[PDB]
Amino acid sequence: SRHVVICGWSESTLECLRELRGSEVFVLAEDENVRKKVLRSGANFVHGDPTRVSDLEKANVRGARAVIVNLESDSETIHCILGIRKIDESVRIIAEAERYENIEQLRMAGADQVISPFVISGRLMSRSIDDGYEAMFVQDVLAEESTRRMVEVPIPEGSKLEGVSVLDADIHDVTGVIIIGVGRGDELIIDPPRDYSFRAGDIILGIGKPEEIERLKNYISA
Amino acid sequence: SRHVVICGWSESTLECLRELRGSEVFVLAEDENVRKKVLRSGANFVHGDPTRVSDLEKANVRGARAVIVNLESDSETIHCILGIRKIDESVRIIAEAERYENIEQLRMAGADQVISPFVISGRLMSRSIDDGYEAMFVQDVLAEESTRRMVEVPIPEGSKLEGVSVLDADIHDVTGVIIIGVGRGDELIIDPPRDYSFRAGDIILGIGKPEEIERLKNYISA
Amino acid sequence: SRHVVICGWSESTLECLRELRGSEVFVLAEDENVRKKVLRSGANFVHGDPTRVSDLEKANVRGARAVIVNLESDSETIHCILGIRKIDESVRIIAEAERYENIEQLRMAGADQVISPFVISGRLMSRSIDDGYEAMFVQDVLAEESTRRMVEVPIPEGSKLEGVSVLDADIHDVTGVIIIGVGRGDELIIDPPRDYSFRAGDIILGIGKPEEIERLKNYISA
Amino acid sequence: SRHVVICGWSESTLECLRELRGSEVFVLAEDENVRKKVLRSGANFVHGDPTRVSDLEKANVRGARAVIVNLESDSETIHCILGIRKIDESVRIIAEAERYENIEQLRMAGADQVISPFVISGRLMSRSIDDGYEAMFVQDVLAEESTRRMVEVPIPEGSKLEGVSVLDADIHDVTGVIIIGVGRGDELIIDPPRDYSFRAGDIILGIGKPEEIERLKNYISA
Amino acid sequence: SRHVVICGWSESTLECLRELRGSEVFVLAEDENVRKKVLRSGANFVHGDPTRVSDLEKANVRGARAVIVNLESDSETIHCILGIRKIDESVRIIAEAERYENIEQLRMAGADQVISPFVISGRLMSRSIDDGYEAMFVQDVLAEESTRRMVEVPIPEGSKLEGVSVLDADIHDVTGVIIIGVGRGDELIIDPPRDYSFRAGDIILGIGKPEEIERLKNYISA
Amino acid sequence: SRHVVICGWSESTLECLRELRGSEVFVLAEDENVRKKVLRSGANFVHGDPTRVSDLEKANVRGARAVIVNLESDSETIHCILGIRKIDESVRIIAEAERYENIEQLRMAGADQVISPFVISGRLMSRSIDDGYEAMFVQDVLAEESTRRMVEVPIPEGSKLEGVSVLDADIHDVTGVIIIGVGRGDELIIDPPRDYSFRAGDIILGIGKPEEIERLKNYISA
Amino acid sequence: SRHVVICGWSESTLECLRELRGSEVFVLAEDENVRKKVLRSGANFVHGDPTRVSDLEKANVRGARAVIVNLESDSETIHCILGIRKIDESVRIIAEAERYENIEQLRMAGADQVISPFVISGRLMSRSIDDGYEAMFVQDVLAEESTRRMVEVPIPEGSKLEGVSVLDADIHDVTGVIIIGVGRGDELIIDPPRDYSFRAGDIILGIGKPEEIERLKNYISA
Amino acid sequence: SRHVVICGWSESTLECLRELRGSEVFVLAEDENVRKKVLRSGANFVHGDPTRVSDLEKANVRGARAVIVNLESDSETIHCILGIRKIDESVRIIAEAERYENIEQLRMAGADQVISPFVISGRLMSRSIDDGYEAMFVQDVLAEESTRRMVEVPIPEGSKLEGVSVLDADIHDVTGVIIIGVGRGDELIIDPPRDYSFRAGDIILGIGKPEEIERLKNYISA
């Protein structure tokens, strides 16, 4: 079915729910004081040790749409992932890493996608000591979306750009949206060549103003 | 004004310490156990309460190059920042936010740069449930830097691009680097207008491969 | 629109509850142990995080008669105040400060009235090493009310003192009550000049025996 | 010998020390963690149990100028006082109470002055739900001294007012200071009658501005 | 009525219940984990702070047959007693002291009877280092009653010994029971003179075998 | 064999230390914080686990004069005793019991003398609900020694009572001291038979006033 | 009379529960958190103190089939065993020891079978520094049973091997199973002499593949 | 270089050290409290986080003879192992597992030998509910060695049994030792066939008495 399991619970998992559908969601956590918070956010709760194979099963890891792992240490996170893989070799796994050196480990454990927020943060700290416009960008487009947002956008099964090359698409100058890359199953091509051409299903990874995104959305189908 | 003060301690601030000279660095924290780790990474350690004005003072917040604030809760981060502002009204302050709602408040308290690692981490989760091209872009360029990298590159007091427009300079088509924004004295102009004109001192924010970046360094110099 | 919200729970807020109706009081606190204490004091209890905006919203901060903030540290107190302001710019906020240096900060955050019991206590301690008449005054009119009280008394919509000079009114002679100040429109003129003229809505701040206070209430009326 | 012993440690006693000498003060507390705080404030530390009679002896309670008692509970405070009286029946004891019901008890145990910060606080909170002119006066006279200040001023061995009645002295009109009482050896007479005549070593308790207070001192001189 | 209140809870209060009637008994304690234990032992439980006057009232201290105090520190025990006295000047109070130096304190607080088990123990330890028959006696007559017990026995309103002197009673040699003392309201006379004479109501404090106690019981009435 | 080992620490063992030379004394305990108190009372402190044979060994349990065992639970007391018996089969062991049911077990583990302070304390409570003559006897002679006292008095290698019977010696009627028992080599004969005959070395256990005891010392000597 | 009692809860006792019926198992533990873990393993839960005799009584220790004792320290384990013996002299006790030195002590207390997993583990660790065939044998027949198992197999009331010599029986040749020992009446003869004769009720202790074990069961029968 | 690193500390690793040298052993643990224990056992202590790659480096994992991993959770153990393999891909790693499901996982992470004390334990508990001959054998051969012992014995560079079949060697009848397998470089052949012929450096795994073992060594010599 369409359900999602979340292991552990923190401010990032709380944020993750703002964007998700509560019925859909099962939070698996060791500590009970988390139950009220999880329920208030409109998700289901499961009391269990998320490093225990039988408890991961209990929380419906098997048919799940995706599993999100964020435990209190990299040690527990890895271990959770090892567990999940024993239950389902092919379920999509998203996992938060703490220490840079364990990004690798989570990936050889089974994480399909890793996130290192404490490493991004730690580096934006050092680059920003004198000014750091990089930090401004991250904060104002990834975090707050105060003027511009980054977006994944599908070329529909309609047309307009079907078969058309990026050079002939001239998206930046037609839309106002910068293209960062094109996603086609399992690989993101960043800065795609003039000659690379589009098909229905491809995801465009862009940056633009809300009105610019509306132009882009319009100019891809019909 | 060459020393940097860090308030509190975590993997963020550890990563922070990695890429800047730990000899200019003073870490101020309540917890004794943190001392060992801090000295081990080549910084000095001041034992004190970062919410206490007299403790901020004694840790040389005064004419410091920058103060990095990352405490165990937003409450204490905010308080700490208010404390630093009574000591020095103009010192550069960088600060980590946990909760979205408290970004605004760190800013109002007097933070020059806010970082939101959990807000970012949480968006990337819910965005990554099926695809997560956005997430792999962020992982691979802001965290791991496996192929491409994000750079703030200064236009040197030297020559080539002074006066020349973003349209005329054609930076991407010349150099390979996708240009995301130009930064000038506190502001970042993202996707600048064609007729924008480069001045010396400007910071170019862009994404490229290390040798694409190299070509950009040259192109832009005297 | 007359319910009161109290954030946090201490002997202070217990005492505050003596003089309040109790059914119309809502105490918001993180710690579940507070529930029985609150219910025994005859007030209502909301379990939530008073630093979290949405929890403040749910405790009915908006358009409450007043909010009393007394958290476990000044950091949390300040933070809670910032939260309340976000929900309601105008609601009356009364707040307890621990450290002298945070008195100003609570005000900047938005507190309409700050109270510094430990600063008061500490000054009385140093001043009382040898004799401390000052201490026993405070103790016996602000705390125990053993013989005298301090009161705020409004000049009724009625008359008698309308237009009348403070010299001409002879309030201390007629009434026994030492006038300390007159308050109007949130300015407290302490020890007003002889020529200061009374009007309706003015609040007399005085010290008196309970009989002297009856007396002040008849003198001021009709 | 005029050294001062303080039992326990808190923002209260921190503020106390502000006005005291420091090289003359001995803080007695059970917690080793308090030591750094007490030294950083210019006082001497004694590691002991302030409820233990022999530890109290070790802290030189015997000949002391005064002992200030402020422990973590009324229980402990009461106990510590009982301890002191067993060692010295006539040493000056100043002690902070938390709960109201225990004021009498600190007294019975032997406290010469009791102080109720939380009771004062809770009072001012509930009285401030609308206007708070009272609270305003307290903050700005006992705590902040932003405008006026309280004062004890002895009637010197000397002259001017010896045998002069309060009516004749006319202190408010000469000085601008509001008399609130006369301390007459353990006695505080509040709002003294007009035919009360000042004698040797009476202590006047007043409220006034810095220059009003300076004027009082001259007017009462030799 | 006939109810008894117990403050605090320990192995000695558990033992005390072996001999008491459960309905009769109210245990007042701060900590909930004690509730199941108290209920299992057949007593009633009250959740409350036994140093709080209002909670002592809540637990029915007022009309109680007796109140037994055994808190975790002498500080809390004394304080409890001070509280109880404010509620009922004449209720019988039995209290456990920890430190020898506080035996006095509990008594001037209001305890009608004090028990110092840690002092008795500590001394029997030192006296028993080489042999200590004293310890054997305490342990085998006060604790285990393995062969002999110590007993309080009332001379009934019957007769036999009514008016008779202890010399003429020859109790030791008639009964086998050693007399340690005679209790008559408020005072125990130890080693009563040959001439002292008996009346109905007097309690005999003895030591004997079960059969010896039976002879004594017999030989006092009818 | 002149040193004494104490296992664990409490007010019991503090009282114990009071009346014997702290220079012969080694205290063994898990808790670091206990060190300060122990040195302060003139004993040495060994930091170790009293349930661990190698730790008992290293604390000189071997040929010690006696070992006093008072640990935080009966479980550990019992274990500790078993541990000491593997090291020395015949060293004198004195031990504190908390629970009645565990007296038997400390004994079976190998304790020469058991002490039950809570069992005793608990009996005295329920016995003291109305009268408590028993309790005041125990308080006043085993704890406080306000008038009478309990004494173990040795019959010296000297003279007077050798061979003489308890009937002939008439100790009480001669001396004032109530005689409770005679102790001979591991046993205590309480209320000995008339024809019992005193031998040198016997210990008389009795209750008297200090000068009644003095008369007994003389009467019994050479 | 076939219920089993388990004192304490650990991965050990979880594992033990695999091979037991579960409905007939009662786990006694102090910590309420254990309840959910037990109920998930399909066993019943009693909340009590397994060191307290009356709690053991209430968990039905008396006449249970066996009691398994696995507490958090050897002290508690020993103590619990002593408790059980007091209730039932004959019930089978199986116990887990942590420290080598306590193996003997658990037996003295009354354990019918002791198990030392950490002693076993520690020996295998030191012995395995270089190659450890011994380790992989243990791992693969005592733990994982990946290829072979160890079994106890009874000589049926039937016959075939009745009276037959172990040399004459050729068990290893016929059956594939290495015989290690024969047990009768709680003596285990390991590696019996050639001339040792089998009888009914004897238990063969062997190592074999599951097919070799089927084989042993037919050979031994009929 | 043949120093041994141990990660973590417990009764396991204490027993390990029993048979190891000690001046060659380095224990790596996070807890400062472990230091005293590790020194009192003749080993060296390193204060570090055994899950931190750089701390592992600091402990000289690089060239080590072997590393023993035994942390407080399987999570940590797995993580520590992943750490070691990143530093050294071929160093001998021996690791203790708690839960069964994690045996494979320690292996996948890189453990050369895994040990399951709790799984072994739980097995022997449930199999011992009636007879426990199995458990008896384990205790008295792997732990206590009260009677027999296990052994690995290499077939020396020398002679006697080179190319000799197990049938011809007839080891049980010559020696009295039960052969259980032959180790042949990473291979453990259990119950080897009769026409298996011993070659160079094979390791025989057997059970026997001290003198049976001594006989095996002679019989297999040069």
Coordinates of N, CA and C in Angstrom, one line a residue, chain D residues 1-78:
Chain D
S1 N 35.8 40.5 64.5 CA 35.6 39.7 63.3 C 34.3 39.9 62.6
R2 N 34.3 40.2 61.3 CA 33.1 40.6 60.6 C 33.1 39.9 59.2
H3 N 33.4 38.6 59.2 CA 33.2 37.8 58.1 C 31.7 37.3 58.0
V4 N 31.3 37.1 56.8 CA 29.9 36.7 56.6 C 29.8 35.3 56.0
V5 N 29.0 34.5 56.5 CA 28.7 33.1 56.0 C 27.4 33.1 55.2
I6 N 27.4 32.5 54.0 CA 26.2 32.3 53.3 C 26.0 30.8 53.1
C7 N 24.9 30.2 53.5 CA 24.6 28.8 53.3 C 23.7 28.7 52.0
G8 N 24.3 28.0 51.0 CA 23.6 27.7 49.8 C 24.0 28.7 48.8
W9 N 23.5 28.6 47.5 CA 23.9 29.4 46.4 C 22.9 29.5 45.3
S10 N 22.6 30.7 44.9 CA 21.6 31.0 43.9 C 21.7 32.4 43.4
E11 N 20.9 32.7 42.4 CA 20.9 34.1 41.9 C 20.7 35.1 43.0
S12 N 19.9 34.8 44.0 CA 19.8 35.6 45.2 C 21.1 36.0 45.8
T13 N 21.8 34.9 46.3 CA 23.1 35.1 46.9 C 24.2 35.7 46.0
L14 N 24.0 35.5 44.7 CA 24.9 36.1 43.7 C 24.8 37.6 43.8
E15 N 23.5 38.0 43.9 CA 23.2 39.5 43.9 C 23.6 40.1 45.3
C16 N 23.4 39.3 46.3 CA 23.9 39.7 47.6 C 25.4 40.1 47.5
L17 N 26.2 39.2 47.0 CA 27.6 39.4 46.9 C 28.0 40.6 46.1
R18 N 27.2 41.0 45.2 CA 27.4 42.2 44.4 C 27.8 43.4 45.3
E19 N 27.0 43.6 46.3 CA 27.2 44.8 47.2 C 28.2 44.5 48.4
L20 N 28.4 43.2 48.7 CA 29.4 42.8 49.7 C 30.8 42.8 49.3
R21 N 31.7 42.7 50.3 CA 33.2 42.8 50.1 C 33.6 41.6 49.2
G22 N 33.5 40.4 49.8 CA 33.8 39.2 49.0 C 35.0 38.4 49.6
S23 N 36.1 39.0 49.8 CA 37.2 38.4 50.5 C 36.9 38.1 52.0
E24 N 35.7 38.6 52.4 CA 35.1 38.4 53.7 C 34.0 37.4 53.8
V25 N 33.6 36.9 52.6 CA 32.4 36.1 52.5 C 32.8 34.6 52.3
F26 N 32.1 33.7 53.1 CA 32.2 32.3 53.0 C 30.9 31.6 52.7
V27 N 30.9 31.0 51.5 CA 29.7 30.3 51.0 C 29.8 28.8 51.3
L28 N 28.8 28.3 52.0 CA 28.8 26.9 52.3 C 27.7 26.1 51.6
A29 N 28.1 25.1 50.8 CA 27.2 24.4 49.9 C 27.7 23.0 49.8
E30 N 26.8 22.0 49.5 CA 27.1 20.6 49.4 C 27.7 20.3 48.0
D31 N 27.2 21.0 47.0 CA 27.6 20.7 45.6 C 28.9 21.3 45.2
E32 N 29.9 20.4 44.9 CA 31.2 20.8 44.3 C 31.1 21.8 43.1
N33 N 30.1 21.7 42.3 CA 29.9 22.5 41.1 C 29.7 24.0 41.4
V34 N 29.3 24.3 42.6 CA 29.1 25.6 43.1 C 30.4 26.4 43.3
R35 N 31.5 25.7 43.5 CA 32.8 26.2 43.8 C 33.3 27.3 42.8
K36 N 33.3 26.8 41.5 CA 33.7 27.7 40.4 C 32.9 29.0 40.4
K37 N 31.6 28.9 40.6 CA 30.7 30.1 40.6 C 31.1 31.0 41.8
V38 N 31.2 30.4 43.0 CA 31.6 31.2 44.1 C 32.9 31.9 44.1
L39 N 33.9 31.3 43.5 CA 35.2 31.9 43.3 C 35.2 33.0 42.2
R40 N 34.6 32.7 41.1 CA 34.4 33.7 40.0 C 33.6 34.9 40.5
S41 N 33.1 34.9 41.7 CA 32.3 36.0 42.2 C 33.1 36.7 43.4
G42 N 34.3 36.3 43.6 CA 35.2 36.9 44.6 C 35.0 36.4 46.0
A43 N 34.2 35.4 46.3 CA 34.0 34.9 47.6 C 34.9 33.6 47.8
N44 N 34.9 33.2 49.1 CA 35.6 31.9 49.4 C 34.6 30.8 49.5
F45 N 35.0 29.6 49.1 CA 34.1 28.4 49.1 C 34.4 27.4 50.2
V46 N 33.4 26.9 50.9 CA 33.5 25.8 51.8 C 32.6 24.6 51.4
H47 N 33.2 23.5 51.1 CA 32.5 22.3 50.7 C 32.0 21.6 51.9
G48 N 30.7 21.7 52.2 CA 30.1 21.0 53.4 C 28.6 20.9 53.3
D49 N 28.0 20.2 54.2 CA 26.6 20.1 54.4 C 26.1 21.1 55.4
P50 N 25.5 22.2 54.9 CA 25.0 23.3 55.7 C 23.9 22.9 56.7
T51 N 23.4 21.6 56.7 CA 22.5 21.1 57.7 C 23.3 20.3 58.7
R52 N 24.5 20.1 58.5 CA 25.4 19.4 59.4 C 26.0 20.3 60.4
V53 N 25.7 20.1 61.7 CA 26.2 21.0 62.7 C 27.7 21.2 62.6
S54 N 28.4 20.1 62.6 CA 29.9 20.2 62.5 C 30.5 20.9 61.2
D55 N 29.8 20.8 60.1 CA 30.1 21.5 58.9 C 29.9 23.0 59.1
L56 N 28.8 23.4 59.8 CA 28.5 24.7 60.1 C 29.6 25.3 60.9
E57 N 30.0 24.6 62.0 CA 31.2 25.0 62.8 C 32.4 25.2 61.9
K58 N 32.7 24.2 61.1 CA 33.8 24.3 60.1 C 33.8 25.6 59.2
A59 N 32.6 26.2 59.0 CA 32.5 27.4 58.2 C 32.6 28.7 59.0
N60 N 32.9 28.6 60.3 CA 33.0 29.7 61.2 C 31.7 30.5 61.4
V61 N 30.7 29.8 61.6 CA 29.4 30.4 62.0 C 29.5 31.0 63.3
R62 N 30.3 30.4 64.2 CA 30.5 30.9 65.6 C 30.6 32.4 65.8
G63 N 31.6 33.0 65.3 CA 31.8 34.5 65.6 C 31.3 35.4 64.5
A64 N 30.6 34.9 63.5 CA 30.3 35.6 62.3 C 29.5 36.9 62.5
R65 N 29.7 37.8 61.5 CA 29.0 39.0 61.5 C 27.5 38.7 61.3
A66 N 27.2 37.9 60.3 CA 25.9 37.4 60.0 C 26.0 36.1 59.2
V67 N 24.9 35.3 59.2 CA 24.8 34.2 58.3 C 23.6 34.3 57.5
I68 N 23.7 34.1 56.2 CA 22.6 34.2 55.2 C 22.2 32.7 54.8
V69 N 21.0 32.4 55.0 CA 20.5 31.0 54.7 C 19.6 31.0 53.6
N70 N 20.0 30.3 52.5 CA 19.1 30.2 51.4 C 19.4 28.8 50.7
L71 N 18.7 27.8 51.2 CA 18.9 26.5 50.6 C 17.8 26.1 49.6
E72 N 17.9 24.9 49.1 CA 17.0 24.5 48.0 C 15.6 24.2 48.5
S73 N 15.4 24.0 49.8 CA 14.0 23.8 50.2 C 13.8 24.5 51.5
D74 N 12.6 24.9 51.9 CA 12.3 25.4 53.2 C 12.7 24.4 54.3
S75 N 12.5 23.1 54.0 CA 12.9 22.1 54.9 C 14.4 22.3 55.3
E76 N 15.2 22.4 54.3 CA 16.7 22.5 54.6 C 17.0 23.8 55.3
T77 N 16.3 24.9 54.8 CA 16.6 26.2 55.4 C 16.3 26.3 56.9
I78 N 15.1 25.7 57.3 CA 14.7 25.6 58.6 C 15.7 24.8 59.5

